[PDB]
Design a protein around this ligand. Structure first.
Ligand SMILES: Nc1ccn([C@@H]2O[C@H](COP(=O)(O)OP(=O)(O)OP(=O)(O)O)[C@@H](O)[C@H]2O)c(=O)n1
Ligand SMILES: [Mg+2]
Length: 215
């Protein structure tokens, strides 16, 4: 067992309404959990509990090891595209290349005269929303970790590009890794080992896509 929540209830504000209520799930090592639900349902808050920024008022939580987190809000720091993706981690050519390929960034990078040394975040290039999202995803995936927390990482991408990168990056490149993906897309829920649908803090559904189909 790699990540467990058992009867978890939590509050952002003392005496407030709970942001998560009686949440239950289990992820085995190397599995994929999809976390879905409407705005404000508590999906990012769930990831924050795993990262220790939100403590449970009821229930138990299990997780161990290093975390790599991809925010739903893409970001860039001043530096090259290579520096933004490696972001202080040791460099390896093969690992870097495999990530940028899985994230479709090789096409973008190949069009620049400076290639991977193009400078971002310093007033030169203005990246599109989808470029910034794929760079942010690549940064999180390049980091070596035991658990990957990918919070709606496909912002600004069209549905086919999102499908392709879900398959090449989250399913293929990351096949051996424990992953929690916040996402609402049907194919992602179908390919996940488990699905957790949140609604106003509560567990709307927890199980497999197959079990939901059977209902
Ligand atoms: N520091 C915080 C973070 C969140 N919240 C509240 O906790 C609820 C859930 O927030 P969040 O987990 O961020 O919702 P998401 O499910 O991630 O919504 P979205 O899809 O829009 O990202 C919201 O009512 C939000 O106002 C809060 O009070 N204080
Ligand atoms: Mg969120």
């Amino acid at each position: 067992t790699e990540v467990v929540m058992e009867n978890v209830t939590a509050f952002w504000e003392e005496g407030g309404t709970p942001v998560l209520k009686d949440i239950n799930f289990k992820i085995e090592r190397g599995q994929l959990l999809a976390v879905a639900g409407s705005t404000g349902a508590g999906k990012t808050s769930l990831l924050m509990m795993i990262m220790g920024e939100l403590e449970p008022s009821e229930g138990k939580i299990k997780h161990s090891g290093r975390i790599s987190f991809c925010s739903q809000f893409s970001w860039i720091m001043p530096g090259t595209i290579k520096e933004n993706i490696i972001f202080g981690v040791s460099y390896d050519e093969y690992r870097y290349r495999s990530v940028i390929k899985a994230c479709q960034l090789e096409e973008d990078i190949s069009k620049f005269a400076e290639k991977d040394n193009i400078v971002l975040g310093e007033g030169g290039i203005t990246l599109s929303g989808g470029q910034r999202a794929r760079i942010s995803l690549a940064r999180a995936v390049y980091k070596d970790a035991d658990l990957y927390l990918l919070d709606s990482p496909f912002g600004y991408l069209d549905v086919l590009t999102e499908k392709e990168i879900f398959e090449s990056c989250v399913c293929k490149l990351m096949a051996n890794k424990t992953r929690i993906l916040v996402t609402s897309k049907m194919e992602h829920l179908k390919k996940a080992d488990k699905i957790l649908i949140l609604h106003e803090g509560s567990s709307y559904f927890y199980g497999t896509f197959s079990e939901l189909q059977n209902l």
